[PDB]
Structures are given as structure tokens and as C-alpha cells.
Amino acid sequence: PLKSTKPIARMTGHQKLVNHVAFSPDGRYIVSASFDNSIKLWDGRDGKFISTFRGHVASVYQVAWSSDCRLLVSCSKDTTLKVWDVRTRKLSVDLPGHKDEVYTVDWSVDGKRVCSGGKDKMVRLWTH
RNA sequence: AAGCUCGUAUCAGUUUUAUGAGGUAAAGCGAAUGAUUAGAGGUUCCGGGGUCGAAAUGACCUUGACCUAUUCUCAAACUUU
């Protein structure tokens, strides 16, 4: 917006709705959570399509990036949280535990913990 | 309208006894019908067509069907039961 009204690019490719989009803290890359059972990676500057993170069986509600800017955590309908190493684009860790859907995810400023909450109503905090 | 043959002689707009018959409710498309959905990324002697080497399995694209990786799981009135 500062540079211009024209959009840099339009990013198409998702099968279903984009519920949430997030730039990394450095702003280099974007991971976006989509309903299509994938969270998609895009180059933040140009808007080009890097790849799909398949692994989710169901809609992905939100994404939140780590303070360290290496990873993104998502919470999905499939009732798991997935931390993905974005750089490698490989699934770093799958963290099951919720009985029901996980609506919200957040990654702490210090980087130490990830918090989650959702349909199950219980908070689960995850640590290194 | 016009006849024949008989007698304790034909039953019931109201009440109890639930044995048969049926194709309206449910389900499926994994051998029957339909609105069996919507995309991207590859591989080319020789699946089928051009340009450029007199040539030799010298090399490089585009335009249609697949595979791998996803989504929906097909309206109650099509049929049978």
C-alpha cells in the first residue's frame, strides 16, 4: 500500500476458503491456512506459489508464526496442532491431544511456548 | 308389470377378541438411471501434427487422454423389497 494501490499480485490456488493468512515476523514468507486441508506457502515479496503443506485431513482454521521465524503452528479441525518447519517445508512436529477441534493457536514472543484452545474447551500449552 | 318354490324363515349406520393383505416413512450406487463436481505442477526417437541439420536414436516447444499429491460422496418422489 505504501508503494502503490495496485496489488503486487493475486494469489490463487486454494480449493476452499482462506480463513487466515500470516506473514513471518521477518516478512520474508507467508504461510496461509486454508480450508482445503492444506496450508499453502507463498513468497511474501512477489506472491509466487511455493508449495502445499499437505498433512491436514480437514480444514485449517488459523496459523501463527514463531518468534524465531523458522516455523508456523496451525490448529485445525482434525483436532491436532501441527508445527511445520516452513523453511524446509517439512512437517516438524505433529501434536495430537485435543479431543475436539482446535480453533486458535498462538506462538509466544519469547518462543518458549505455543498455546492452543478450541472446541474441547481445554487449553493445552506445549513446550520444548 | 307378469310367475313358481318355503319357513324360526333373510341379521345390524352404536360396543369387546387382531390372524392376512399393502409400498407412503428409513438406507445404498461398493455391477443399472441423473446435476458419478471443480484445479495446478511433469514426462516427448516411435500416441497422433510444425520450424531448423543433404544425414546418423543430434537437440529444443505448444495444443488433447493418465499416474502421484486434494475436495464432495451423489435429490424423498427411477425400479424392487
Curated annotation (Swiss-Prot):
Disulfide-linked positions: none
WD repeats, residue ranges: 13-52, 55-94, 97-128
Effect after changing residue 61 to E: Impairs interaction with NSA2
Main location: nucleus
Alphabetical UniProt keywords: Nucleus, Repeat, Ribosome biogenesis, WD repeat
Cellular compartment(s): Nucleus, Nucleolus
GO biological process: protein-RNA complex remodeling; ribosomal large subunit assembly
Superkingdom of source: Eukaryota
Function comment: Involved in ribosome biogenesis. Required for processing and efficient intra-nuclear transport of pre-60S ribosomal subunits. Interacts with the AAA-ATPase Midasin (MDN1/REA1), which is essential for the ATP-dependent dissociation of a group of nonribosomal factors from the pre-60S particle.
Family: Belongs to the NLE1/RSA4 family.
Assembly notes: Associates with the pre-60S ribosomal particle. Interacts (via WD repeats) with uL18 (RPL5). Interacts (via UBL domain) with MDN1 (via VWFA/MIDAS domain). Interacts (via WD repeats) with NSA2.
Protein name in UniProt: Ribosome assembly protein 4
Source species of the chain: Saccharomyces cerevisiae (strain ATCC 204508 / S288c) (Baker's yeast)
Gene: RSA4
Residues of the full protein shown: 388 to 515 of 515
